[PDB]
């Protein structure tokens with residue numbers, strides 16, 4: 048089991064860390080959602096699908112910078128949503144193919160009432176997402192750590 052990103056970086060067998068850079072809607076109103084879709088950013092596969100079933104969770108999702116200060120919301124993982132920043136570990140998603148498959152994670156972030164002006168700065172860290180991979184074969188328990196950076200400013204209108 049290993050993963051790759053939309054910026055040409057990777058994390059091998061055994062886990063590790065990678066940076067991910069996301070284009071964000073430049074204007075988000077209070078009462079509306081900024082959607083940060085990582086399923087177009089992070090992809091993984093199973094290296095022995097004939098024999099091994101891989102299990103993948105979102106173990107933890109943390110907010111940073113302007114997201115920490117200026118937003119609240121949820122994280123959607125494989126069709127169900129949970130509070131973000133996270134308060135538990137999600138259920139497992141199965142990976143059962145050698146073919147790249149997206150990691151089905153998306154943030155739904157809505158501005159807090161005091162947000163206004165530039166609420167997320169270009170280049171800043173906005174989140175860290177921990178993917179936990181296990182399997183039905185041995186005792187491997189690996190963390191794939193995804194550091195999520197904004198490519199651009201996000202403004203909350205006054």
Ligand SMILES: CNC(=O)c1cc(C(=O)NC)cc(-c2ccc(O[C@H]3O[C@H](CO)[C@@H](O)[C@H](O)[C@@H]3O)c(C)c2)c1
Nearest residue numbers: 048049060061092093094095097099101181182185187
């Ligand atoms: C003597 N030979 C053999 O023992 C052996 C023959 C084959 C083989 O015949 N393949 C066609 C494949 C394998 C193989 C590959 C990857 C692998 O582990 C990696 O990949 C797994 C599946 O993604 C992850 O669960 C795991 O955490 C890790 O990342 C493990 C445990 C075993 C071994």
